[PDB]
Design a binder for these strands. Structure first.
Lengths: 61, 192, 118
RNA sequence: CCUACGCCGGCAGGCGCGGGUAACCCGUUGAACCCCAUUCGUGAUGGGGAUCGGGGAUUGCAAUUAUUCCCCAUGAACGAGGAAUUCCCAGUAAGUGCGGGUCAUAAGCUUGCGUUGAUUAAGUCCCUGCCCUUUGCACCGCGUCGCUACUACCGA
RNA sequence: CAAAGUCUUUGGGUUCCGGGGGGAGUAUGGUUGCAAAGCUGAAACUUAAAGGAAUUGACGGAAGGGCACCACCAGGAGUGGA
């Protein structure tokens, strides 16, 4: 399901050329499930993404 | 997917594309010692619109062409080809019985096996599946010459390693190698 | 899709392979296209043809006008060689089907390309 | 030799008449794109003008292998370009013209200037390179024959 | 290394045994053993090194960092097509 989600941060630029900006993710369903994901392109602190799904997450370890 | 009707047409109708593809096909045929000075049956792999396949017909060869693009095949239909055109992904295998073809030729196409977009097997698996099936569908002592565009030396080594493991022997011919604008890599192989 | 190509084509299913040849053939449409006659090429095709599979694909396409086993010679019998050229090189399937009898799948031939995808 | 102004040239150019040995005179350096109207209407067409045939005028000892410029006529390829690859962070790239320079004419070359004005990101070590730090050919499972000559064996 | 010391300032008694490296522990003979093999044990020829301790700088197919649009990414203009 379509999930809109708050941006908390920008951890690094993962990838091979500095191309996946690293984003801690709050949800907008008021749940504190703060999954850290990867985006492509510029995101500043306090933005809001459209996660296509919350099951598939970015790499921990 | 990469080509459409518009782009397939613009590629096949470009005089500069025609001339370069014709030169590389004739160079591949010169390197192909098994059809060179012999009649043969051939498989053209990544046949596109049949620019390489027409030049096989010029030397009197009978051929089957494999391509993954409908629009490249549809443009080939209107060019009075004598070969059989087949819609097919070379990375899934070569779908002929053992010992069918004297030789195989490919012009500008096998570097796409390093690409991981079309299917969800690894390029490494598809590359093995291509070379192992290609070895099988060839006669004993049959030849394969592939002009290809590698992005780097790791891609060249990976292609060489997969061909080696499949049972091929031979090497790499690099024409004009001091011009990285005009240099061309030809993989030249033979089966057991 | 020349008839000869039938003998060099098999089902792409990994489980049918390497038992997946020959495919059983039906043609909704056919054509004859003029091709140069080469007896030497026809005679040099014989040693690369699976003859048993050749007869079966001809039978499927409604033809028993074929020798029981492979043939041999100096190419001076134009009768049998012209009939082989007519069949192998000149008859083309435009529209038709290719059924594998082991996986059950039916592939199509359409203007005039055989397609071997899932 | 830079030109203004006037006269004569359908177009390149002549003829008379000054300033300027120079932020002055050319010079207010009066430009191109741009804009507003007109015509064309998606095709090898009026796009592209190459490729040439007739002339005309300058530069010069000397234009024939077209010096250059102008005026008719000619109108090919080219339908957004494959493999690969160059340059690119804000008055930037790109569109677009103006002056210097070998200099008799010679200018798609080079050397600045202005005008119109963008996209994208402000990251990284994968590819390309570049700079530092640390660290230290033993061996095993290529062969067949032929006739003649020569060395060393065994020997009826 | 407390003996691998008291050794050119060379002598306490006494047994075995080594003379470049290969050829070689092969031959051949004797001897023991049921046998495999053990003990003793050559030479022809070939080669200028084989070896023993310790001792240092280039390449890494070794690893980390760091920079650059004469690198990439996102993209623009393209060239390469006539």
């Amino acid at each position: 399901p379509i999930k809109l989600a708050r941006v908390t941060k920008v951890l690094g630029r993962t990838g091979s050329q500095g191309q996946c900006t690293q984003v801690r993710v709050e949800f907008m369903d008021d749940t504190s499930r703060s999954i850290i994901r990867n985006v492509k392109g510029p995101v500043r602190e306090g933005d809001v993404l459209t996660l296509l799904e919350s099951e598939r997450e970015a790499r921990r370890l | 997917l990469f080509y459409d009707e518009t782009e397939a047409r613009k590629y096949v109708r470009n005089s500069r594309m025609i001339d370069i593809q014709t030169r590389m096909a004739g160079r591949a045929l010169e390197l192909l010692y098994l059809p060179e000075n012999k009649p043969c049956y051939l498989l053209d792999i990544g046949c596109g619109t049949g620019l390489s396949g027409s030049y096989l017909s010029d030397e009197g060869h009978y051929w089957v062409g494999l391509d993954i693009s409908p629009a490249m095949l549809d443009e080939a239909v209107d060019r009075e080809i004598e070969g059989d055109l087949l819609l097919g992904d070379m990375g899934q295998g070569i779908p002929f019985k053992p010992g069918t073809f004297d030789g195989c030729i490919s012009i500008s196409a096998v570097q796409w096996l390093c690409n991981a977009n079309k299917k969800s097997e690894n390029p490494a698996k598809r590359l093995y599946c291509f070379f192992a099936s290609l070895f099988s569908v060839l006669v004993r002592g049959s030849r394969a010459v592939l002009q290809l565009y590698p992005e780097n030396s790791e891609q060249l080594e990976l292609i060489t390693t997969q061909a080696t493991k499949a049972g091929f022997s031979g090497g790499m011919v690099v024409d004009y190698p001091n011009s990285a604008k005009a240099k061309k890599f030809y993989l030249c192989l033979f089966s057991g | 899709m020349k008839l000869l190509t039938h003998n060099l084509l098999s089902s792409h299913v990994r489980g049918v392979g390497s038992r997946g040849f020959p495919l059983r053939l039906q043609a909704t449409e056919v054509r004859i296209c003029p091709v140069e006659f080469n007896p030497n090429f026809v005679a040099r095709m014989i040693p690369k043809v699976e003859w048993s599979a050749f007869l079966e694909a001809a039978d499927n396409l409604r033809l028993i006008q074929v020798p029981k086993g492979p043939v041999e010679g100096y190419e001076e019998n134009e009768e049998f060689l012209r009939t082989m050229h007519h069949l192998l090189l000149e008859v083309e399937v435009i529209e038709g089907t290719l059924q594998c009898p082991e996986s059950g799948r039916m592939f199509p031939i359409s203007r005039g390309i055989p397609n071997m995808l899932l």
